[PDB]
Amino acid sequence: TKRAVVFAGDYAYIRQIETAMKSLCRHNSHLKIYLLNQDIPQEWFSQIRIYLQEMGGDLIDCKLIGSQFTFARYFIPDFVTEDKVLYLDSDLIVTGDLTDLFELDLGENYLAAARSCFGAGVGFNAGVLLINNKKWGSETIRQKLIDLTEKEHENVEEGDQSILNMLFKDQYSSLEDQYNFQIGYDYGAATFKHQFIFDIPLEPLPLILHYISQDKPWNQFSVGRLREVWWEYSLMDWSVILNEWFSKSVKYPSKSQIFKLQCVNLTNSWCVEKIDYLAEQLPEVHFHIVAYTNMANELLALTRFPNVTVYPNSLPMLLEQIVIASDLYLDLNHDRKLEDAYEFVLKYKKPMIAFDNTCSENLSEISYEGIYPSSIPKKMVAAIRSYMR
Amino acid sequence: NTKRAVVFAGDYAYIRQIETAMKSLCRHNSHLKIYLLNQDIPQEWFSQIRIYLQEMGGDLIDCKLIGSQFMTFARYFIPDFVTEDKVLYLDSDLIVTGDLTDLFELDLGENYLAAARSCFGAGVGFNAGVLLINNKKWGSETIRQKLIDLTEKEHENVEEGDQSILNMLFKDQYSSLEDQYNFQIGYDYGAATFKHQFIFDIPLEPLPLILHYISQDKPWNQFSVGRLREVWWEYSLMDWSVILNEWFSKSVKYPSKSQIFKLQCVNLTNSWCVEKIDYLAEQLPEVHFHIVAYTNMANELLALTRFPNVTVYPNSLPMLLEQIVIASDLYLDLNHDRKLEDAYEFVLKYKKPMIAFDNTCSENLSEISYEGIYPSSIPKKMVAAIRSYMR
Ligand SMILES: [Mn+2]
Ligand SMILES: [Mn+2]
């Protein structure tokens, strides 16, 4: 059975994130990792998802694209479905079996959280949270965290960590220091002459190393201890991690599914009739959605699907190569139709289909191999599948 | 067999591009001595990747451009670092898809370089992203300085960074490379913009030997419009183990130089000058030297990142030094006066041997404090002394 973990980071931190995830996975099978992000490319998710699945888990691309949306942590209950989830920062390393941490009862607590810097900071450290997702959702904790941040964000040193403290004061149980061992405090410890911090044993290795502060181990120069450990995981090939688990008979089939069809549309509108439904309904079809300008969030968010490539600011000749490379044109876009498409559809004799509300006004029913009901799009799903061999 | 010289140039921010480019090269070509011109790539990366290149009969050379004698123009300094008579320069925004022997073995004669044309002929001159360089002649004819002087003169009235200058100076003096050895597939947006339709009829089966993803439209961005996006990602996401296992099956497998340290040495400095530290690091690869300061460090010291066996710790603090001193075998009191008390306090307290050069002793705590004072003019004695503390 699957244990739920969540990270949040943009593509600029993909090296840290991937590493955090590598360490985690090294020592823990059956992980359903949810990754909140905005800009991480989809080829990365396709490949890493294969590995997670092979270890009896999964990888969920949670796109924070839309006006309703770094304070990504806040949105955890909007994406995560299980009752309990572990949030983890990306500037950190997992050194062993986290069973205890996973299997811990929160009771009526909103979350479990370790103290800031071994007792030196106020409150708890936000970098490891065993979260009661059921209660975060069913108590509207997301919107509460949002509204608390509008009301006073300046009056609070330390970002969303201070806000999570300010809301959950005395409403959290507490994790031991080794499940969020803030080795990155070293520079601050040394700064404030906290001599006994350097006396804490680093053998055996703490279960979670959290390299807080600006003094990061992956930088050129770092003064903090355990710099060498981050690099062990960062430079570890995924095949090392996997062969460990395929040595101890923990091996599952992936879903590296290949496409049985290549579909394309060119749009000059945010609205592409049933594109989301068609995407989820046809995993085996790569949809190519092209534009000549910037795209609105409703389309950019299609990055969440493994099987949809989106092309903002393309050009006619690039569209043309896609049409050549395609099996089927889907005439789904609403407002102004762009002529270049019909041109290329005729030119390379490409079949075309549409919905009753997305047909061209300045065109005729022989141009379409079928016109399908936009309120019964499963009929379009069956039509599309009929072009597969 | 023997090694073919290759040089990349790029900073840490592009490490994902650099490493991918190096994976696609190594996937298809064994026995590569790779040089890499940079200022901020951490040593742990080099250490690990070096192991791989060597296992394939090659090597990886950290070419650190730290010091006022030197990054957008890193190419210029190729003939200061590279020692072979011929070297292949490569941009890091690119993929190698096969055997490059025809390129490596090409005779330049008296040509200073070989290059492919810019954008299939669309642009003026050659593209600077793949260069078969006559390094012997670049060195022997002071090309680095002329490139710097032609950049000093008329930098303001040229447009392509240092490709302009490269083309300005070598105009009518290079042999040509076929397009497939610098296939600028990244020109696709540009070729679509200016309606160069025939660009798009150039067949991409079989795959060009060198794909070069020029322009702001990169295949590794969230979105891009250019073709052959898939192939960059095929390499980026490939484990090094696949590359190595492919070679081992074709009987190409060399042992690595995995040196393991026999001693740990430390110094705290308040100056740029740490007596013989370069000499010492070179003579003593089996010794891990740790050089610490409480402030920024000068380039002479930051440059020590070139050695695989020296860690350098700018902006450290007393309690951090304390922990390095605890873990270490020997204190080398090499800094050039303005001795910081902390070192001597930690040295006594944890009962650490401490040696020095004749020109680098404290004036205060006299010659019983040092287990040996060695000659600064005969530093081979300090070397032999350091090894006598090994086990
Ligand atoms: Mn953090
Ligand atoms: Mn380039």
Of B221, B218, B232, whose CA–CA distance to B186 is shortest?
B218
Residue B198 near residue B85, CB atoms below 8 Å: no
| Distance set, CA A227 to CA A114, A223, A242, B229 (Å) | 22, 8, 24, 35
Query: What's the DSSP call for residue A152?
Result: S
Q: Are strands A208-210 and A92-94 parallel, antiparallel or unpaired?
A: antiparallel
Give Cβ neighbours of residue B333 (< 8 Å, ≥ 6 apart): B267, B339, B343, B354, B355, B356, B360, B361, B362, B370
Is B313 an interface residue toward A (CB < 8 Å)? yes
Q: Which residues contact A196 (CB under 8 A, 6 or more apart)?
A: none
Cβ–Cβ contact A256 with B under 8 A: no
What residue segments make up the domains of chain B, in order of their start? 1-255, 256-391
B218 CB within 8 Å of a chain A CB:
no
Report the helix count and the strand count for chain A, using DSSP H and E.
Answer: 15, 15
Determine the 3-state secondary structure of A23 from DSSP: helix
B313 to chain A nearest CA, in Å? 6
Beta strands B32-38 and B113-117: pairing type?
unpaired
Question: DSSP letter string over A187-224?
Answer: HHHHHTT-GGGGGS--SSPPSEEE--SS--TTSS---S
Sheet of A352-355, strands arranged across: A308-311, A285-290, A261-266, A328-331, A352-355, A371-372
The DSSP element (H or E) to which B373 belongs, if any, is: strand B372-374
CA-based R_g, chain A, Å: 25
d(CA A19, CA A8): 13
CB contact under 8 A, B322 and A219: no
What is the rounded distance in angstroms from the CA atom of residue B328 to the CA atom of residue B287?
11
CB nearest B192 (choices: A191, A225, A316): A316
In total, the C-beta contacts within 8 angstroms joining chain A to chain B are 93
- Residue contact A41–B320, C-beta within 8 A: no
**b/e burial code for range B223-243 (CB count within 10 A of at least 16 → b):** bbbbbbbebbbbbbbbbbeeb
Listed in sequence order, the DSSP H helices in B223-374 are: 229-236, 240-249, 277-283, 299-302, 318-327, 341-349
Q: Residue B36 corresponds to which tokens in the numbers above?
A: 């890499």
Would you call A235 and B45 a contact, using CB atoms and an 8 Å cutoff?
Answer: yes
Residue B253 backbone dihedrals phi, psi, to 5 degrees: -165, 110
CB atoms within 10 A of CB A195: 11
d(CA B73, ligand 2 centre) in Å: 13
Residue B8: HSE in the Cβ half-sphere, 13 Å Cα cutoff: 26
- Tokens 């699957």: give the residue: A2
Reported resolution, Å: 2.4
Q: Record the tokens describing residue B242, joined without a space.
A: 């696949």
Per-residue tokens: B50? 């070096």
Rounded Cα–Cα distance for residues B108 and B113 (Å) = 7
Are residues B40 and B68 in contact, defined by beta-carbon separation less than 8 angstroms? no
B294 min Cα distance to partner chain A (Å): 10
Smallest Cβ–Cβ distance between A198 and the set B41, B312, B323 belongs to: B323
Is residue B314 within 8 A of residue A221, CB to CB? The reply is yes
Q: Which long-range contacts (CB under 8 A, 24 or more apart) does A381-384 make?
A: A381/A278, A381/A281, A381/A282, A383/A353, A384/A261, A384/A263, A384/A278, A384/A282, A384/A285, A384/A328, A384/A330, A384/A353
Q: Which helix (H) or strand (E) holds B59?
A: strand B59-64
- Most A-contacting residue of B20, B23, B44, B202 (CB-CB within 10 A), to test interface: B44
Calpha distance A328→A285 (Å, rounded): 10
Q: Which of B20, B22, B76, B24 shows the shortest CA–CA distance to B218?
A: B20
For residues A169 and B237, give the distance between their C-alpha atoms in angstroms, rounded to a whole number.
43
Of A37, A241, A259, A315, which to mutate for an interface test with B (greatest number of B Cβ within 10 Å)?
A315
Helix, strand or coil, per DSSP, at residue A288: strand
Test mutation, A46, A219, A230, A317, chain B, max B CBs within 10 A: A317
Structure determined via: X-ray
Residue A48: CB atoms within 10 A of its CB come to 22
Using the beta-carbon criterion (under 8 Å), do A235 and B48 form an inter-chain contact?
yes
The CA distance from B173 to B144, in Å, is 16
On chain B, the residues whose CB falls within 8 A of the CB of A63 are none
Give the closest-approach CA distance of A115 to chain B in angstroms.
23
Provide the shortest C-alpha distance from residue B188 to chain A (in Å).
8
Chain B residue with minimal CA distance to A320?
Answer: B200
